[PDB]
Design an enzyme around this catalytic site. Structure first.
Site, short mmCIF file in Angstrom:
data_model
loop_
_atom_site.label_atom_id
_atom_site.label_comp_id
_atom_site.label_asym_id
_atom_site.label_seq_id
_atom_site.Cartn_x
_atom_site.Cartn_y
_atom_site.Cartn_z
N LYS A 239 8.76 -9.95 -15.13
CA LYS A 239 7.38 -9.48 -15.10
C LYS A 239 6.45 -10.43 -15.87
CE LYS A 239 7.07 -6.19 -12.39
NZ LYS A 239 5.95 -6.07 -11.41
N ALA B 227 0.80 -1.22 0.00
CA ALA B 227 0.00 0.00 0.00
C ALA B 227 0.83 1.28 0.00
CB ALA B 227 -0.95 0.00 1.20
N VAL C 71 3.96 5.23 -16.02
CA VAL C 71 2.91 5.76 -15.16
C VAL C 71 3.35 7.14 -14.67
CG1 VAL C 71 1.41 5.32 -13.20
CG2 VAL C 71 2.37 3.41 -14.49
N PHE D 65 3.19 3.94 -5.36
CA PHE D 65 2.68 5.07 -6.12
C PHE D 65 1.24 4.82 -6.57
CE2 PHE D 65 3.09 7.57 -10.33
CZ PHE D 65 2.57 8.71 -9.75
N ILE E 34 8.10 -10.17 0.28
CA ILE E 34 7.15 -10.94 -0.50
C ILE E 34 7.90 -11.87 -1.45
CG2 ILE E 34 5.57 -8.98 -0.33
CD1 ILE E 34 5.86 -9.31 -3.67
#
Length: 316
Positions: A161, A8, A191, A11, A58
């Site tokens: 990815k 969280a 982005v 960006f 993670i």
């Protein structure tokens, strides 16, 4: 019920959380540290509808086990945005960053989670070796790089990815009768946009580089998408049934650095003369636009908001 938002602090993920609190959802975010959680709690003004769990690494497949042991009865939607010898340090960690939360769902909440939204990337769609004028990448295009070819310094990031997204689709393929959830992926390009909180780097650094460039600095750098558009699509991905099983390609067209310079010159008149002067591989994602059903922010809008926020921090 409750929405789980991975990573969280991101960006994109902060905007996702803002949008979910906009609609009075109950939100559980995961961050890497207690300090990060307390910071975000303060910045959202102690909203009683937002809480946090600490997940430091993670790359561990068991990372999200405690989250679903505690809140598996309340988590109805999961928005996975977080991401972590190229095989041992990038590729396998990425595949694991995808598979771990899905294994946790399968273990501790197989019948409660109804929708999983995974932030992927355009890197899982494009072909580096086809960057030919007749090739158009759509939502069904996949990066064809193989596992063996993804272990060189050019194909490593896009390969990781790509295989991270493939791992999610393969999990859903092999676990149809173990989990209820449906999958949707978000695949953004470059982005841009403002940070959710003024007080707080990304690819927006490009803009930040030209905002501060001397006028003598010499000037298609890719495709753009506003961070708020990515965040909004993330939530529509679990709300709308026509987005079930879809790869949503989030892009709003090509951009150049001269476009950034032109926006800077005409929309922020204080910079004209202090920055470089003004001057008067393709994607087809019309399907994503139709399925999403709203109008993306234009390049001018995203650049203006980015620069306005930067200049506001600087007292300009």
């Amino acid at each position: 019920m409750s929405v789980l938002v991975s990573g969280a602090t991101g960006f994109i993920a902060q905007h996702i959380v803002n949008v979910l609190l906009e609609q009075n959802y109950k939100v559980i975010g995961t961050v890497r540290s207690q300090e990060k959680a307390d910071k975000l709690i303060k910045q959202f003004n102690n909203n009683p509808n937002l809480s946090f769990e600490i997940v430091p690494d993670i790359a561990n497949l068991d990372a999200f086990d405690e989250v679903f042991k505690k809140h598996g009865k309340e988590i109805k939607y999961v928005i996975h945005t977080a991401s972590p010898d190229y095989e041992k340090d990038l590729l396998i960690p990425a595949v694991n960053g995808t598979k771990g939360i899905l294994e946790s769902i399968k273990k501790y909440a197989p019948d409660t989670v109804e929708r999983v939204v995974i932030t992927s990337s355009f890197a899982a769609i494009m072909d580096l070796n086809k960057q030919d004028s007749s090739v158009i990448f759509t939502e069904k295009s996949w990066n064809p790089v193989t596992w063996e070819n993804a272990q060189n310094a050019i194909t490593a990031y896009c390969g990781s990815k790509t295989f991270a997204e493939k791992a999610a689709w393969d999990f859903l393929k092999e676990n149809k009768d173990s989990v209820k959830f449906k999958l949707t992926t978000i695949n953004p390009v470059f982005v841009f946009g403002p940070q959710l909180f003024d007080e707080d780097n990304t690819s927006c650094e490009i803009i930040n580089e030209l905002l501060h460039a001397p006028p003598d600095t010499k000037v298609c750098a890719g495709n753009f998408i506003d961070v708020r558009d990515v965040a909004k699509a993330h939530v529509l991905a679990f709300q709308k049934d026509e987005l079930i099983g879809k790869r949503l390609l989030l892009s709003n067209g090509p951009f150049s650095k001269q476009d950034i310079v032109n926006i800077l010159n005409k929309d922020f008149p204080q910079l004209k003369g202090k920055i470089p002067p003004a001057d008067p591989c393709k994607i087809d994602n019309e399907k994503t636009k139709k399925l999403l059903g709203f109008e993306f922010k234009s390049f001018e809008e995203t650049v203006y908001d980015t620069v306005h926020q930067i200049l506001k921090k600087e007292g300009k």
